[PDB]
């Protein structure tokens, strides 16, 4: 709030312009990083209703149709486990230092010119991309990325991935229930590991 600014700008704001260009480059770089990690295949497959997955229980990792929010259960626990700025800085700045995306401009003048830009991709869009990847993988195997709609039963996808690791199909098809129970128990163990505040 200086009484003279244009002289100060014309003498020393070009350094700030260069450094602001550096920050803008970092920001666009970060958005393109999110783009290249989450948008490898730009195909939206709707999640089928949970029917006939061979005994495997994918109800936790798939989004729940009952909830209007498209976050699934596991990523909901991941969101709740990470608290933004769980230190004294939430008392110093009133949680405006994190990218809550609902921060007011009083936080911006609190930081004296420092602002937090919202990310390019909304977390709802990230949830939709994750749901599309999960549904496409579970339904179509590895043919999701080639570009087609090649449905295949989950048993044969397990069989061909077993051929990938080097085991014949018979080992899968004789022990389908045991493998399904082991996978469900492992998912439950991950659920209890995240839910126990560890």
């Amino acid at each position: 709030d200086s009484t003279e600014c244009s002289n100060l700008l014309l003498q020393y704001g070009s350094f700030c312009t260069q450094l602001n260009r550096a920050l803008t480059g970092i920001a666009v770089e970060q958005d393109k990083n999110t783009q290249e990690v989450f948008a490898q295949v730009k195909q939206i497959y709707k999640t089928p209703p949970i029917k006939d997955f061979g005994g495997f229980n994918f109800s936790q990792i798939l989004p729940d149709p009952s909830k209007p929010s498209k976050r699934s259960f596991i990523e909901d626990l991941l969101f709740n486990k990470v608290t933004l700025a769980d230190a004294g800085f939430i008392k110093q700045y009133g949680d405006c230092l994190g990218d809550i995306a609902a921060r007011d401009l009083i936080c911006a003048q609190k930081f004296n010119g420092l602002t937090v830009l919202p990310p390019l991709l909304t977390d709802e869009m990230i949830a939709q991309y994750t749901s599309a990847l999960l549904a496409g993988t579970i339904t179509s195997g590895w043919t999701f990325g080639a570009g087609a709609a090649l449905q295949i039963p989950f048993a044969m996808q397990m069989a061909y991935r077993f051929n990938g690791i080097g085991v014949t199909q018979n080992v899968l098809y004789e022990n389908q229930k045991l493998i399904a129970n082991q996978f469900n128990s492992a998912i439950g163990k991950i659920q209890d590991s995240l839910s126990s505040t560890a």
Partner: peptide, 14 residues
């Protein structure tokens, strides 16, 4: 190699 012209088929594991 991009496939096309899909067809539905009734399959069995064995």
């Amino acid at each position: 190699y991009v496939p096309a012209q899909e067809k539905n088929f009734t399959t069995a594991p064995a």
